Structure 1
Amino acid sequence: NLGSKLLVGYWHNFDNGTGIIKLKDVSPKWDVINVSFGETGGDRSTVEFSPVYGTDADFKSDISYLKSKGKKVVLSIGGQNGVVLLPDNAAKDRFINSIQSLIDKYGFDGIDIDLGSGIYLNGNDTNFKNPTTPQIVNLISAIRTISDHYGPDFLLSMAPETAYVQGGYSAYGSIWGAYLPIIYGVKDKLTYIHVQHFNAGSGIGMDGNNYNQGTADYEVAMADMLLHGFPVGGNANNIFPALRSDQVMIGLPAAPAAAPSGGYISPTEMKKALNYIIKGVPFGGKYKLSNQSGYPAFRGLMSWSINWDAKNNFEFSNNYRTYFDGL
């Protein structure tokens, strides 16, 4: 089903200046399309989705078309208008039910967790293997429930910001390390995670060194933490286990303007990072990969976004599709 080297692209269910691309006009170089976004209302628990073009039937059909071409179409939950809060079981239930309705209604292949707010580790919540914060406990439970409700082909991805994942290396509490219990809690269902390596400023690698976003060293350092695992919150006895390599992707801006706070990296520089991550071929960078000979099963790249890419002469899709095809 899913290839071993993927390009995952976010698809704007909205016009933000980059315009709208009809599903059928989406470049075939994308393996997975993350429809953005499923959003919530006042109750911040019931997820709603209405296609930005066409009737419900038309959209269902365009999705079926893409799926007929072997593409996966996933519903991304989050964005600025998709805040989800699950303070109790009642909220979790509305969330689960609303999500399942949408998947059934439009035939989505799975869901993408792209929540960038409302997610905190409460005081006393110190064990990523056993979270105690309701939001996090309930989110894990809801995700497991939804996953189990569908067949073997159900796709589950996540796109947390670095603070929620790699940030766990520096601290564990509040947002810092907050997705770790989520990842750990659903790792048996997780298809892949593509952390947002952008709008992130700088990040500390397992070597305790600070790296700037948008540089090859940074990409390697941040990905290596998931590929190898790392000690959490300065505790050598609290190791977050490595994910499967085929569960690890990197999320990148398709163009400089797709990440106004920085993070874009040129394909030429990104290919150096990829060659190192995947093949264990260094490029004279400062960061030293945990695995000398690389992680060949590294899963691929995610991008914000399909719409930005199209507006940028398809630089992202063309460059990386060719690169991965060349493997």
Structure 2
Amino acid sequence: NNLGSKLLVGYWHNFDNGTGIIKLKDVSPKWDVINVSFGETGGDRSTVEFSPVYGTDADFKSDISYLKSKGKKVVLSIGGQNGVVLLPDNAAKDRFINSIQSLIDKYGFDGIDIDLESGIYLNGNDTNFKNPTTPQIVNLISAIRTISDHYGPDFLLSMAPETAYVQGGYSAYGSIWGAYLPIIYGVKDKLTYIHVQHYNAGSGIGMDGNNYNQGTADYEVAMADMLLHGFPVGGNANNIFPALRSDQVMIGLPAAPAAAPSGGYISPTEMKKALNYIIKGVPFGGKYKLSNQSGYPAFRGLMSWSINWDAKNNFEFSNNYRTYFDGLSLQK
């Protein structure tokens, strides 16, 4: 896929929410991947649809080809308030698969991003993340594998679940708690990276059993470390969720305070402390102790909601973190 080792992945508003529309060619080159937000659904909650917020279909395709020629990736994100996906059975699953492939074919997207919240949860008795039994989860995994298999090894697959669905699995396994764990595990060989939303999250319990507060360096390290290292699920020491490759692990952050109205924004100064600890093993006097002393140098980078918020906030996120990653001189 020719993706770099330290990425900035930015969500791109296919809409004007007050922050304005940025045409694709006007997006800062500091973003490596652009997650077009969002493919949406109608009555049947399964047929995904997408139309460019500006200009014609042909021109949007051309814009995407241009970006791709510059080494960027353009990914279709599925989710948002108007992108609820429900796959209770095979019929629904097929509408989903076919509609997504049609959109990828039409616009030349490099892959898809799963940003689903509503609709995802574990049924009773669904107890094993390696072998899920909830139809929504089973069918989403199947659809994702089918789509990725359709496009081959270069297909880009990402996802942006909220913490309850991933790290929350440390506390409970059922309902929304840990509900993305089977999805992640089920598609791990196809997964390019996961960027959990470390925002609008309140607090989170680390693998050390301690509580950490969103928007702090300790919290960022504690939450990422769970995917970098793996962790016991639902208080069961014998049910360990395995580590992902470090190059599959990113952290999702708000570009500006207002990009996450319930909190989660962290200053670049504090975030760089977290990054230096995660990547280089260099501590910063925090309470959280990293699982691997020497660090996880192949940690993949940062995601942000969003490109549009970033541009409205003096490009603080993109400028700070591009410089940080560009300045790394990792040896190994």
Instruction: Using structure 2 for the length normalisation, give the TM-score.
Output: 0.98
Rounded Cα–Cα distance in structure 2 between residues aligned with 1:178 and 1:99: 23
Q: CA deviation at 1:44?
A: 0.1
CA distance in 2 between partners of 1:111 and 1:30 (Å) = 17
For 1:58, the equivalent position in structure 2 comes to 59
SS at match of 1:250: strand
Distance in 2 (alpha carbons) for counterparts of 1:75 and 1:192: 15
Partner Cα separation in structure 2 for residue 174 and residue 237 of structure 1: 21
The one-character-per-residue Cα deviations of 1:163-184 (angstroms, maximum 9, x if unpaired) are 0000000000000000000000
Using the TM superposition, give the Cα deviation of residue 221 of structure 1 relative to its aligned residue in structure 2, in angstroms: 0.1
Residue 45 (str. 1) matches residue 46 (str. 2): yes
| d(CA) in 2 for partners of 1:321, 1:15 | 26
CA distance in 1, matches of 2:282, 2:148: 37
Instruction: Look up the SS of the partner of 2:252 in the other structure.
Output: strand
Report Cα offsets for 1:135-177 as digits up to 9, x if no partner.
0000000000000000321100000000000000000000000
Q: Distance in 2 between matches of 1:151 and 1:190?
A: 12
Q: Provide Cα deviations, 1:246-280, integer angstroms capped at 9, x if missing partner.
A: 00000000000000000000000000000000000
Which region of structure 1 is more displaced relative to structure 2, 150-159 or 216-225?
150-159
**Runs of 4+ residues deviating >4 angstroms:** none
Distance, in Å, in 1 between the alignment partners of 2:153 and 2:26 is 28
1:243 aligns to what SS in structure 2? coil
Cα distance, 1:85 vs structure 2: 0.1
Can you list the C-alpha shifts for 1:260-310, whole angstroms capped at 9, x where unaligned? 000000000000000000000000000000001100000000000000000
TM-superposition CA deviations, 1:60-82 (whole Å, max 9, x none): 00000100100000000001110
SS in 2 for 1:316: helix
Contiguous gaps of at least 5 residues in structure 2: 328-332
SS in 1 for 2:29: coil
What is the CA distance between 1:209 and its match in structure 2?
0.3
Which residue does the alignment assign to 1:140? 141
Number of the residue aligned with 2:200: 199
Identity across matched positions, percent: 99
SS of 1:251 mapped into structure 2 = strand
Distance across 1 between alignment mates of 2:76 and 2:308: 16
- Partner Cα separation in structure 1 for residue 276 and residue 112 of structure 2: 29
In the alignment, the residues of structure 2 paired with residue 79 and residue 200 of structure 1 have an alpha-carbon distance, to the nearest angstrom, of: 17
Q: 2:128 is matched with which residue?
A: 127
Q: Once the two structures are superposed, what CA deviation does each residue of 1:97-116 show, in whole Å capped at 9, x if it has no partner?
A: 00000000000000000001
3-state SS of 1:10 partner: strand
Matches of 1:208 and 1:284, distance apart in 2: 19
Supply the distance in 1 between the matched residues of 2:15 and 2:69 (Cα, whole angstroms). Answer: 24
Question: What is the rounded CA distance, in whole Å, between the counterparts of 1:151 and 1:121 in structure 2?
Answer: 29
Q: Deviations over 1:228-248 (max 9, x none)?
A: 000000000000000000000
| Separation (CA, whole Å) in 2 of partners of 1:97 and 1:65 | 26
In the TM superposition, 1:1-327 aligns within 5 A as 1-326=2-327
| CA distance, structure 1, for counterparts of residue 64 and residue 18 of structure 2 | 23
**Aligned pairs, number:** 326
**Aligned equivalents of 1:313, 1:154: Cα separation in 2:** 33
**Structure 1 CA distance for aligned equivalents of residues 118 and 188 of structure 2:** 21
Output the CA distance in 2 between the equivalents of 1:261 and 1:185.
Answer: 31
TM-score by length of 1: 0.99
Provide structure 1 residue ranges, at least 5 long, that are not aligned to the other structure: none
SS of corresponding position for 2:231:
strand
Q: What is the aligned-residue RMSD (CA, Å)?
A: 0.3
Distance, in Å, in 2 between the alignment partners of 1:128 and 1:100 is 27
- Partner-residue secondary structure (3-state), 1:193: strand
Q: How far apart, CA to CA, are the structure 1 residues paired with 2:23 and 2:48?
A: 23
| Distance in 1, Cα, partners of 2:275 & 2:201 | 19
